[PDB]
Every structure is written in C-alpha cells, then in structure tokens.
Amino acid sequence: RRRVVITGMGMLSPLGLDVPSSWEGILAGRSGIAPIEHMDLSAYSTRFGGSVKGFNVEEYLSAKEARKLDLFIQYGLAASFQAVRDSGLEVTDANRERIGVSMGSGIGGLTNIENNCRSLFEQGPRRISPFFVPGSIINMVSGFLSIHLGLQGPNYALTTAATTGTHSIGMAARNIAYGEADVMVAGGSEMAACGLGLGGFGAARALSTRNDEPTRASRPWDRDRDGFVLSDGSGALVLEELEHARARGARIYAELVGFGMSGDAFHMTAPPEDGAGAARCMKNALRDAGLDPRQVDYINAHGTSTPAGDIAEIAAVKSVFGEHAHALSMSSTKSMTGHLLGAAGAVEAIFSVLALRDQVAPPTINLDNPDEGCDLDLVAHEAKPRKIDVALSNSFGFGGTNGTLVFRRF
Amino acid sequence: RRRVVITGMGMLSPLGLDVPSSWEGILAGRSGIAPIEHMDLSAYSTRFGGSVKGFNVEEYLSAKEARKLDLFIQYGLAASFQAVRDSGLEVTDANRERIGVSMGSGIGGLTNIENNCRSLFEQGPRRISPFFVPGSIINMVSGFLSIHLGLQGPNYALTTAATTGTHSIGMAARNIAYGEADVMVAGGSEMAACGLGLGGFGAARALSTRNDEPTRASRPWDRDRDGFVLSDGSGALVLEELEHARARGARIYAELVGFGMSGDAFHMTAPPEDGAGAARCMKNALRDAGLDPRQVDYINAHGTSTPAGDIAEIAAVKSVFGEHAHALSMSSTKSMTGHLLGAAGAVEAIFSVLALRDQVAPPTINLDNPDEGCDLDLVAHEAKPRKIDVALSNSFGFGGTNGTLVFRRF
Numbered sequence: 068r069r070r071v072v073i074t075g076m077g078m079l080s081p082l083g084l085d086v087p088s089s090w091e092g093i094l095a096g097r098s099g100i101a102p103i104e105h106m107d108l109s110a111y112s113t114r115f116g117g118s119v120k121g122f123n124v125e126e127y128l129s130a131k132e133a134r135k136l137d138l139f140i141q142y143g144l145a146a147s148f149q150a151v152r153d154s155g156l157e158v159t160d161a162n163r164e165r166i167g168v169s170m171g172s173g174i175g176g177l178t179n180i181e182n183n184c185r186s187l188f189e190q191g192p193r194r195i196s197p198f199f200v201p202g203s204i205i206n207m208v209s210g211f212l213s214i215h216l217g218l219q220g221p222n223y224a225l226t227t228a229a230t231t232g233t234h235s236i237g238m239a240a241r242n243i244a245y246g247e248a249d250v251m252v253a254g255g256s257e258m259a260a261c262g263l264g265l266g267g268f269g270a271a272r273a274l275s276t277r278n279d280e281p282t283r284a285s286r287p288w289d290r291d292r293d294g295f296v297l298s299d300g301s302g303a304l305v306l307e308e309l310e311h312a313r314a315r316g317a318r319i320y321a322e323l324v325g326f327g328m329s330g331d332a333f334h335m336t337a338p339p340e341d342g343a344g345a346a347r348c349m350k351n352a353l354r355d356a357g358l359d360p361r362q363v364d365y366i367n368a369h370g371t372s373t374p375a376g377d378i379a380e381i382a383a384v385k386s387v388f389g390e391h392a393h394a395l396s397m398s399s400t401k402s403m404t405g406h407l408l409g410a411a412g413a414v415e416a417i418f419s420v421l422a423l424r425d426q427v428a429p430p431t432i433n434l435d436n437p438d439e440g441c442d443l444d445l446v447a448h449e450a451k452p453r454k455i456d457v458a459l460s461n462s463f464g465f466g467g468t469n470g471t472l473v474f475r476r477f
Numbered sequence: 478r479r480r481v482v483i484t485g486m487g488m489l490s491p492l493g494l495d496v497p498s499s500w501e502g503i504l505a506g507r508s509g510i511a512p513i514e515h516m517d518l519s520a521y522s523t524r525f526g527g528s529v530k531g532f533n534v535e536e537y538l539s540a541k542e543a544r545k546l547d548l549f550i551q552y553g554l555a556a557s558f559q560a561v562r563d564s565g566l567e568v569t570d571a572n573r574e575r576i577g578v579s580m581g582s583g584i585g586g587l588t589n590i591e592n593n594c595r596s597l598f599e600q601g602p603r604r605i606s607p608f609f610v611p612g613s614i615i616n617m618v619s620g621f622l623s624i625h626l627g628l629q630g631p632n633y634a635l636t637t638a639a640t641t642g643t644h645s646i647g648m649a650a651r652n653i654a655y656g657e658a659d660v661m662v663a664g665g666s667e668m669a670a671c672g673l674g675l676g677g678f679g680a681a682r683a684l685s686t687r688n689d690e691p692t693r694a695s696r697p698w699d700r701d702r703d704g705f706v707l708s709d710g711s712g713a714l715v716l717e718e719l720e721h722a723r724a725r726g727a728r729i730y731a732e733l734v735g736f737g738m739s740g741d742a743f744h745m746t747a748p749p750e751d752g753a754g755a756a757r758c759m760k761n762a763l764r765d766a767g768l769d770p771r772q773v774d775y776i777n778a779h780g781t782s783t784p785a786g787d788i789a790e791i792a793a794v795k796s797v798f799g800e801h802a803h804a805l806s807m808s809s810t811k812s813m814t815g816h817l818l819g820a821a822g823a824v825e826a827i828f829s830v831l832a833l834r835d836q837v838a839p840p841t842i843n844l845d846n847p848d849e850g851c852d853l854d855l856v857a858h859e860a861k862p863r864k865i866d867v868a869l870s871n872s873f874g875f876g877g878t879n880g881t882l883v884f885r886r887f
C-alpha cells in the first residue's frame with residue numbers, strides 16, 4: 068500500500084474565505100456565529116448560525132455558470148479550486164486519468180429544492196428550472212470540478228451526514244493507497260441555512276436556542292450546552308501518493324496514515340452513553356495507521372455541543388487511550404465554527420493538519436464549566452502550543468455512522 | 478486481496494416485489510411502465526413511469542417506524558432485508574463488527590422534502606416534521622439497516638446519480654477485499670416520481686413524452702428513442718469474503734471480480750460521442766478483474782434510451798472489445814424497467830448475476846429499428862440462452878461519473 072500525503076488545502080468557513088484567514092480565527096478563539104441576515108427568522112426558535120460572509124462566486128466561476136448551481140456546489144468548487152491552486156499540481160494528458168475527485172455533502176441543494184418547490188406550488192411544474200437536477204444533486208461538485216479541470220480519475224460523492232467530509236477524505240486516501248489514483252481532491256460542502264434546514268433541525272430540537280448570545284451558543288462539554296449551531300462552508304484537500312509528490316517537489320503538509328469506520332447500530336440520532344462505536348472507530352483508525360494510542364498528541368473532536376454526544380466522546384477517548392487520555396490534547400473547533408455538517412470533517416481535517424504544521428492545539432472556546440467526567444485537557448479558552456507528532460480527527464453522524472482520520476508530521 | 482462473492486439478493490422493481498418475480502418479468506420481456514396513478518399529472522409532459530406496485534412496508538417495519546421514513550428509505554430497507562434473509566447469514570457478537578452497509582441514492586427524499594415544503598409555505602416552520610432530517614437524508618438506509626440488524630462494520634452511502642448502485646457495490650467489495658469487513662450489504666434505492674422529480678427531469682427535457690404508448694417509450698438504441706423513463710425501486714446484494722461464505726456453507730451466486738471507475742470530464746449531462754470515458758471505465762474494471770476483453774460474454778448496458786448516451790456506449794464497447802464486440806451479447810434491461818436512477822446499478826448487478834446463474838442474456842425490448850452503428854448483438858425482443866462465464870454491468874451518470882462491475886461464474 069502506497070503512502071498518502073496532503074499537498075493542498077482550501078476552505079470557506081464562518082471564520083474566513085480561505086485557509087489562512089480561517090486558521091488565524093481559530094488560533095485567536097474568534098467565533099464565526101452571528102444572527103442570520105439573508106432570511107427573516109422571527110418565526111424560528113434559532114435565528115443565528117455560521118454563515119460564509121462576503122463570498123464572491125465570480126472569483127471562481129462566470130455568473131452564467133454560478134446561477135445554475137446551488138450554493139453548496141459553489142462552496143465546494145471554491146474550496147476545491149483553492150486546494151488545487153495551493154497544491155501547484157499541473158494537469159496534463161500524461162496524468163489526467165490518475166487524478167480524481169470525492170467531494171460530498173450531507174444535505175446537498177436544500178435551498179434550490181425549496182425555491183423550485185415555491186415555483187411548483189405557486190405556478191405549476193413548467194416553472195421548474197431546467198438546471199434544477201444537475202445544479203442540486205450532491206455529486207455535481209465532483210462532476211463540475213472534473214469538467215472544469217479535465218480530471219478523469221475516480222469521480223464520486225459520499226453522503227454520510229456529519230461524517231461526509233471524513234469519509235470523503237478516507238476513501239479518497241484508499242483510492243491512492245490501492246493504486247486507483249495518484250491524486251484525489253477530497254472533502255465536503257454544506258449550505259443548509261434555508262427555512263427547511265433551520266426549520267428541520269429546529270423541529271428535531273437539535274439546535275441551540277441561545278438567541279441572546281449567539282457567539283456563546285456552541286459550548287462543547289460545557290454543563291449549559293443545549294444543541295449544535297448550524298454552519299455553512301466547505302473544505303477540500305489535495306491528497307497525493309508520496310513518491311508522486313516528491314518527484315514534482317510538492318510542499319507536503321502532513322501524511323494521512325490511518326482511516327477508520329464503524330457503526331454504533333444503536334439509535335438514529337443518540338449515541339450509546341459509553342461511546343463504544345466511537346471507540347471502535349478510533350481503534351480501527353490507529354490500527355490502520357500502525358500506531359499505538361500512546362503516540363496520539365492531539366484530537367480534533369466531533370464535539371458538537373449536544374448533551375449526549377459530547378460526553379459519549381469523552382467516554383470513548385478514556386476507553387481507547389487509558390492513562391494517556393490525560394496526556395493528549397483534545398478540542399472542538401465547532402466551539403468557534405459551529406457544525407458545518409457534511410463539510411465539518413473536511414474543515415476539521417484541515418485544522419488537524421495545520422495543528423501539526425504550527426505545533427499548536429486550537430482551543431475549545433465557551434468551555435466555562437466542564438460537565439461531570441469532562442476532566443481531560445480540552446484546551447479550554449486559549450490555543451496551546453505543544454508537541455504534536457500525531458493528530459486524530461473524529462466525525463460521528465446521524466445513523467451512528469463514525470469515521471476517524473489519523474495524520475502524522477511527515 | 479481477498480475474493481468477494483454474492484450470497485444474497487433483494488429487489489423492489491416495476492416488474493415485482495422481489496428478485497424471482499422481477500427476473501421472470503425480465504426473461505418474458507414484460508414492461509413495468511404504466512400511467513402514474515398516485516398523483517394527477519395532466520399539467521406534465523410525461524405522465525407515465527415504472528412504479529413499484531402493491532408494496533406493503535408493514536411486511537418489513539411497524540407502521541410507527543414507516544411513517545417517519547421517505548419511500549426511498551422504505552424501498553432500500555425492503556431490498557436490504559430480502560438480501561440478508563436470502564443470504565442465511567446469522568449476526569452474532571462474534572461477527573457484527575465485520576458486517577457493514579453501503580446503500581446509496583441519487584436524489585434521496587424528494588417526496589418528503591416536497592411535503593415538508595408545502596407545510597412550511599402554507600403554515601410556517603413549526604409545521605415541519607421532527608423526523609424530516611433523519612427520515613429524508615440518503616445515509617438513513619445504511620443507518621436504519623445497521624440499527625435494525627445490529628451491524629457495526631463500515632457504514633456509509635454513495636450519491637453518484639445513475640452510478641450510485643454500481644459505486645455502492647464496487648466500494649463495498651473493496652472494503653471486503655482490503656479486510657475492513659467480511660460482509661457488506663450494498664446497493665441503492667430511488668423514489669423520485671413526485672412533482673419535483675417528473676417536473677425536474679421534464680424541465681431538463683430528459684424524459685420520453687410517449688404518453689400514448691408508455692410500454693414502448695423505453696427503446697434503447699432504437700432510432701425513435703426520445704429520453705429515459707423514470708422508475709422507482711431498490712436493489713441490494715450481500716457481498717461476502719469467499720472463505721467466510723465457504724466456512725458457513727453459503728449458497729454462492731457469483732464472484733464479484735472487478736470494479737472500475739472513470740470520469741468523462743466532458744459535459745454535465747451529455748457524454749463524448751466516442752464514449753472515451755465509458756471505454757476507460759470498462760478497461761479499468763477488466764484490468765481490476767485480471768480478465769482480457771475476449772473473456773466477456775454478456776454486458777448489461779447503461780442503455781437509458783437517450784439520443785447521445787446509447788450510441789456513445791456502442792462506440793465504447795467497439796473500442797474496448799474490437800472484433801469480440803460482435804461475439805458478446807449486450808442488452809439494456811431499462812427497456813423493461815425504465816431508469817431506476819440510484820437503484821439502476823443495483824438491480825442491473827442482480828440481473829447480471831442471474832444471467833450467470835441461468836445462462837441467458839435478457840432482452841432489449843422495443844428495439845424495432847436499431848440506429849446507425851448499433852449493429853452489435855443487442856438481444857433485441859427476446860431472451861437468448863447462451864454461454865455466460867463473465868458478465869459486465871455499466872453505469873454512466875450525470876457529471877460524467879462512470880462505473881463498471883465485472884462478475885464471473887464461481
């Protein structure tokens with residue numbers, strides 16, 4: 068099996084329109100959460116979230132192309148173009164069959180579906196856009212990116228709720244490991260802040276309702292946590308076979324050494340209280356990496372600010388790491404970004420890689436009063452400079468679908 | 478790399494509520510296409526399609542469980558339960574971590590989204606169902622199946638338009654080949670026959686409008702073809718490591734020996750006229766299988782009854798197979814079933830496996846007048862008994878995403 072390295076990264080997040088502006092936000096403990104402005108929410112119990120601010124799609128696409136694509140596709144293409152540009156890779160006839168794409172989404176084109184539904188109900192089916200299907204389906208980030216850059220390798224899309232970006236990157240790494248591709252662009256994108264999204268998650272009572280202090284709503288492992296904060300954005304990595312990267316003198320950020328998966332097989336939305344499924348997933352990833360739990364320095368947690376999930380993840384970390392659980396640093400960047408759903412795994416993989424580059428554990432902001440049993444190093448309030456050789460990134464999604472990525476300094 | 482065999486199959490299709498009723502339909506050249514009855518379509522240009530007739534979800538689930546799930550999830554669970562029952566596999570503490578699920582969909586819960594949109598527009602966000610998100614997202618077939626049967630292995634969902642079921646089965650086979658699972662339940666499901674689906678595909682001019690003769694609308698490679706016929710249903714296979722299957726004395730249908738992928742990188746909806754991407758995909762699959770093109774006996778074609786796609790697939794088959802292109806049999810079962818979108822690859826994998834079991838090439842019905850260059854053995858009109866050692870199944874999806882599965886008699 069061939070070694071896989073990260074040579075390019077791209078992001079849109081509530082903290083910035085690229086990787087270095089987002090990361091500056093993360094290390095400063097800045098919140099990206101604000102009252103929502105692009106719709107009127109005075110009939111909703113949650114009226115805030117993490118928006119991408121100032122996004123200009125015409126930096127990436129013609130206005131003609133963009134008007135045919137849902138926002139989640141625009142955001143995925145933006146992160147993907149940034150990553151490819153960041154990688155310095157040149158696509159030619161000699162390599163285009165060896166370069167593929169795995170960009171996923173958890174919900175896809177909800178906004179577009181909602182707008183076409185309005186036309187359909189008010190004015191009948193003839194008012195539906197001809198670009199409705201190709202501009203709304205989840206695999207059109209992979210499809211459009213492949214067309215725009217001439218990428219002829221494996222071309223597909225995962226949809227595994229909050230685990231989407233983690234699965235997208237892990238399965239892309241497998242394609243390269245197994246020799247199906249030399250390069251993959253992988254990650255995820257989400258834009259679910261329409262009436263159906265806020266209404267949907269709200270009707271499930273899944274969202275924080277702290278409308279008086281939105282920057283304080285996302286508070287992973289805090290005793291006053293009350294549900295996640297809905298956020299938008301995208302993350303993409305360029306994954307490359309190590310000898311291919313060396314040959315062309317690429318800048319290498321990190322090595323992607325392990326990927327694990329499991330299912331809880333317990334409940335559609337609630338994890339088991341002991342986090343047995345998350346424990347299996349992290350062990351599977353470390354076994355895939357050929358690493359002992361004692362070699363892990365940093366975990367970028369799932370940590371969504373829900374009552375049951377946050378404490379299940381602590382339990383799983385204590386089960387897997389034993390005494391070393393008190394030596395590693397674990398934080399949730401969702402404290403600042405909120406929950407980017409299908410993009411959360413992609414942006415958190417990027418933060419895990421940059422934690423390795425900069426030798427700094429990003430903070431869990433808003434962790435004022437850690438709940439019963441939440442006595443690990445959760446990097447409360449402030450970024451902590453420390454030795455990081457190995458970083459883990461966890462994603463635990465609806466349906467009990469789990470994924471873990473393991474990254475190493477190269 | 479470990480060998481992968483098929484030990485269980487399940488289906489809902491326009492031709493039957495299980496595999497043997499569907500397959501009897503296929504070998505008799507029966508159409509599953511009829512005028513649509515469950516909605517009023519006198520403002521639509523297409524008023525027919527392939528419905529699942531007489532489906533009773535209470536054969537599989539409680540009425541309480543079912544009311545919370547979109548039809549595409551009900552259909553996926555039905556096919557999955559059939560496959561698992563057909564396999565005779567017993568799930569225990571000793572094996573549950575080694576059994577996973579990859580059931581995908583191309584569009585997912587369009588009907589549910591449409592119904593919740595109506596509530597939202599008429600009566601505001603408080604009218605949205607609390608089960609809207611978990612009952613509509615694509616990965617809830619994998620999630621619910623894992624919960625219902627206690628499956629704790631890899632748990633994920635592909636969404637690659639018409640290639641979904643092919644990718645789902647190929648990537649599940651990779652999980653077993655690489656040792657991540659001993660058993661996977663894989664395939665796809667679709668229910669897109671709501672206003673948004675018929676309206677959507679109609680607005681793109683993608684559908685046949687032959688409302689006067691619906692059973693004759695789906696006519697792959699015929700000079701009078703005018704777009705695909707929209708169909709609903711699901712397909713699931715139980716994939717198993719060969720020594721695991723032998724150990725428990727499973728009945729083995731076939732061996733899954735190859736899987737290939739490519740991207741066209743050409744156009745969002747139209748293939749290149751020479752089918753270069755489909756050619757790469759079929760070569761990748763045969764190279765993955767360790768088979769020469771001359772060993773292929775039967776191809777279950779993508780063959781959707783569109784002007785450009787049907788002839789691109791002939792071109793690709795002539796490029797890959799050369800003189801042997803005139804010795805193999807190729808047919809489109811979509812002539813009878815119509816286009817099941819994200820389930821098409823799953824039901825066509827099943828038909829390819831049963832072509833190996835029964836030594837019979839299913840027919841392309843309605844192939845009255847083959848178009849220019851469509852001079853291969855397309856098994857026009859009637860099933861053809863013949864020697865089949867090796868069968869290929871092709872899927873070519875929106876975004877130029879391609880997949881091919883290669884099956885062998887075991």
Ligand SMILES: CC(C)NC(=O)c1c[nH]cn1
Nearest residue numbers: 338342345376379380463
């Ligand atoms: C979404 C939920 C099932 N996931 C979690 O937050 C979690 C934590 N440990 C295990 N699952």
Ligand SMILES: CC(C)NC(=O)c1c[nH]cn1
Nearest residue numbers: 748752755786789790873
């Ligand atoms: C959907 C379309 C792009 N696919 C085809 O029908 C086809 C046939 N050969 C190559 N693609």
